[PDB]
Every structure is written in structure tokens, then in C-alpha cells.
């Protein structure tokens, strides 16, 4: 029930396929903002999650990004399930010294 209102922000190559630095979104849960960014952005779709499942609608998180919750990174929080709510902000960034 419910799309807590919220803000994306992305960084580094993700800046560039989304073709801005950020955007409101919403979603109840931090996958629920996450799969629409990647809707309408496609060109991140395979580089926030992994390209497997290609026949169900499960997905995965990449194994290579670093996602954040007003900075607070899900990494540290209940991971994809950190609970967004009506003015909270998500950041995606991509791996660092690899790739």
C-alpha cells in the first residue's frame, strides 16, 4: 500500500544514462524507487541490477553498486527494504578502484 514520496540522486556513468544528476520517484521500499528508475531509464537497468531471471520478474541488486539512504547507505540499514517515506532521498553509485 502506498509510494512513499522521495528523491534519487545518481553519480559518476548513472548521471549519465539517466541524463540527470537526479529526480523524484516513489516507492514504499527502497526496491520500489529503484524500479522505476530503472523504467523509464532502462540504461540502468542492467547496471543497478542483474541481468538474470529473464523469465519471472524477480530481480537482483548488483553486486558492484553502493546505494544510499540520505546518505545513511542501505549497507548499513535493512538493505532493500529500508522502508523510504514522504521526503527521504536515495543515492546509486557505481564500483570504485574496479570494475
Not at 49 to 70: A, P, Q, R, V, Y
Request: contains cysteine; hydrophobic residues 40%.
Amino acid at each position: 500500500g502506498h509510494m512513499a514520496e522521495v528523491k534519487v540522486k545518481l553519480f559518476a556513468n548513472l548521471r549519465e544514462a539517466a541524463g540527470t544528476p537526479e529526480l523524484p520517484l516513489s516507492g514504499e521500499k527502497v526496491i520500489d524507487v529503484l524500479l522505476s528508475l530503472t523504467d523509464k531509464y532502462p540504461a540502468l537497468k542492467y547496471v543497478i541490477f542483474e541481468k538474470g531471471d529473464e523469465k519471472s520478474e524477480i530481480l537482483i541488486l548488483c553486486g558492484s553498486i553502493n546505494i544510499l539512504i540520505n546518505g545513511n547507505n542501505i549497507r548499513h540499514l535493512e538493505g532493500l527494504e529500508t522502508l523510504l517515506k514522504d521526503s527521504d532521498e536515495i543515492g546509486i553509485l557505481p564500483p570504485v578502484s574496479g570494475g
